[PDB]
Design an enzyme around this catalytic site. Structure first.
Site: not given
Ligand SMILES: [Zn+2]
Length: 273
Positions: A165, A266
């Site tokens: 990401h 996250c």
């Molecule tokens: Zn993440």
């Protein structure tokens, strides 16, 4: 107003998270017990220590990644975009998240476009604009839908290479400060982003890319607060954050979740109600 938050959404860890193949866990074995303790402490910092109202969602054994709530929702002001995760196995996490966000009485927008995918982890919200990483989990269509959802904010994309990401190597560390990894790819990504914006952002380069993922908050009675990785997990990076004397630094362990690609951002969805 940037960094301000009143509530935080988190989700309990499923045992199936520690019942995954070595190839998926980067070759490391997840200590489920320690993972639960690290999550408990993480939540404790946001709730008890920082005073945020915590909304804890129940674990779902069928969803081994359900703990990483950041991926299923991108919140800005009173509007929440329920995303369409890049991985099909996580699409179901949207159900629980949407329910919680509606309970918080927020404007809900759902990503239904079969051709669109987007993980919240690929979204960097500076407070002024959005930077969306085009990766194996987020595509151009997904970015366009996000831009269509937050029309009053500029949205620009950046290629995500050699990382899962965009935020696998960056995150906001302050009102106009972007923590960025020292790697060649991280520095390149930041250069591209900066080139897109008309605003010059300050940057804090961190030796360890994943250590560039931190959580910044602006708490009324405390000021600038920053949750970052511990000196034990990332010695080379821990001292770098110490350069922010105006920030209340809080070391947070996360060794176990990182084994399944879980970083600090996250595991929570921040909301300012
Ligand atoms: Zn993440």
């Amino acid at each position: 107003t940037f960094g301000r938050a009143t509530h935080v959404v988190v989700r309990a860890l499923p045992e199936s998270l520690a019942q995954q193949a070595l190839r998926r866990t980067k070759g490391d074995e997840v200590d489920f017990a320690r993972a639960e303790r690290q999550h408990q402490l993480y939540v404790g910092v946001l709730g008890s220590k920082l005073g945020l109202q915590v909304v804890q969602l129940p674990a779902d054994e069928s969803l081994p990644d359900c703990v990483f709530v950041e991926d299923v929702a991108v919140v800005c002001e009173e509007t929440a975009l329920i995303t369409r995760p890049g991985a099909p196995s996580r699409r179901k996490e949207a159900d629980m998240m949407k329910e919680a966000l509606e309970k918080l009485q927020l404007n809900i927008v759902e990503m239904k476009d079969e051709n669109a995918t987007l993980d919240g982890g690929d979204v960097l919200f500076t407070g002024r604009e959005f930077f969306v990483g085009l990766s194996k989990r987020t595509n151009q269509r997904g970015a366009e839908i996000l831009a269509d959802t937050f029309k009053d904010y500029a949205v620009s994309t950046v290629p995500v290479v050699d990382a899962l990401h965009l935020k696998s190597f960056c995150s906001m560390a302050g009102p106009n400060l972007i923590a960025i990894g020292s790697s060649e790819s991280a520095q390149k990504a930041l250069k591209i982003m900066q080139q897109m914006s008309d605003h010059r952002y300050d940057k804090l380069t961190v030796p360890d890319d994943t250590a560039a993922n931190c959580i910044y908050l602006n708490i009324p009675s405390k000021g600038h607060v920053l949750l970052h990785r511990t000196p034990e997990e990332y010695p080379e990076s821990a001292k770098v954050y110490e350069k922010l004397k105006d920030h209340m630094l809080i070391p947070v362990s996360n060794s176990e979740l990182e084994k399944v690609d879980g970083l600090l951002t996250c595991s929570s969805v921040l909301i300012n109600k």
